[PDB]
Design a protein that fits this description.
structural protein; monomer; Osteocalcin; Ca-binding protein; mainly alpha; about 30 residues
Length: about 30
C-alpha cells in the first residue's frame, strides 16, 4: 500500500490517517 507507506512517513499525514484513514489522509496530503 504505497499510500499508507508514504503517509505513514509524514507525522502529519499519519495523524490525519488516524482520524480518516490512509486513503483520505493521503488524498488530502498528496492530492
Amino acid at each position: 500500500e504505497p499510500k499508507r507507506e508514504v503517509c505513514e512517513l509524514n507525522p502529519d499525514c499519519d495523524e490525519l490517517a488516524d482520524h480518516i484513514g490512509f486513503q483520505e489522509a493521503y488524498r488530502r496530503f498528496y492530492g
